[PDB]
Design a protein around this nucleic acid. Structure first.
Ligand SMILES: [Cl-]
Ligand code: NA
Length: 144
DNA sequence: CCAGCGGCAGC
DNA sequence: GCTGCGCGCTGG
């Protein structure tokens, strides 16, 4: 029932919130990488690996071939496979407990995937813009 | 032309 | 705290 509102800042989290694995994959794609380049590659990745169930079985070299033009391609290919494994087989309440997700991915999860944005204190240029705007407008957006 | 820039783990 | 990973875009 939690739907995060669309904002004037067009965070890709706003469209991926319904599938936490895809949202978290997107945050990994945005590690020191511009969204203008990363997000078109994200759709190619999700076409080949539509779920964590299959991503945890992937050969990281195949993933790295897709990530090549984004940089950090071997590093994040290995991260994506291990992250997808832990996402499905490790006990967790928040995704910061999982390999490859830190404060930025975790803050994204707690703003977009669950209704905990009032408890989040982001330190990310894009998250701050969205989160400040939410604090300033939540009453007019029929929120609590 | 070319330096700066768009998280996370491991140590 | 500190460093390795890393491509293409950006803009003076
Ligand atoms: Cl972002
Ligand atoms: Na983590």
């Amino acid at each position: 029932k939690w739907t995060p509102p669309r904002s004037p800042f067009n965070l890709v989290q706003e469209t991926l919130f319904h599938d936490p694995w895809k949202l978290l994959i997107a945050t990994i794609f945005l590690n020191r990488t511009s969204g203008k380049m990363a997000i078109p590659v994200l759709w190619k990745f999700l076409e080949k690996y539509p779920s964590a169930e299959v991503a945890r079985t992937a050969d990281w070299r195949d993933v790295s071939e897709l990530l090549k033009p984004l940089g950090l391609y071997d590093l994040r290919a290995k991260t994506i496979v291990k992250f997808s494994d832990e996402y499905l087989t490790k006990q967790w309440k928040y995704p910061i407990e999982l390999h490859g997700i830190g404060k930025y991915g975790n803050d994204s999860y707690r703003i977009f995937c669950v209704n905990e944005w009032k408890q989040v204190h982001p330190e990310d240029h894009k998250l701050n813009k969205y989160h400040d705007w939410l604090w300033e407008n939540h009453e007019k957006l029929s929120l609590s």
